[PDB]
Amino acid sequence: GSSGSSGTGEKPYSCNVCGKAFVLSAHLNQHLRVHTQETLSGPSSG
Ligand SMILES: [Zn+2]
């Protein structure tokens, strides 16, 4: 169990916050929200 999940052609968009990926930009933005949101859970992006 050394290698992760085998795949081809890594998505251009990636969530550099928690650890996600997306094919398009709009998809990534929708996600980033969960991070760029005012809450008392953890460190925000801004
Ligand atoms: Zn994320």
The answer as to whether 37 is a domain residue is yes
The answer as to whether 41 is a domain residue is yes
Say if strands 20-22 and 13-15 run parallel, antiparallel, or are unpaired.
Answer: antiparallel
For ion ligand 1, residues whose CB falls within 5 Å: 15, 17-18, 20
Q: Specify the amino acid at residue 38.
A: E
| Domain harbouring 21, CATH code | 3.30.160.60
CA of 9 to the centre of ligand 1 (A): 20
The answer as to whether 3 is a domain residue is no
Name the structure determination technique: NMR
As for how many domains the chain has, the answer is 1
The answer as to whether 35 is a domain residue is yes
Structure tokens at 38: 């005012």
Phi, psi of 27 (to 5 degrees): -65, -45
The answer as to whether 4 is a domain residue is no
The answer as to whether 23 is a domain residue is yes
Q: What does each C-alpha distance from 5 to 9, 22, 35 come to in angstroms?
A: 13, 15, 24
Host domain of residue 26: 11-46
The answer as to whether 2 is a domain residue is no
CA of 1 to the centre of ligand 1 (A): 24
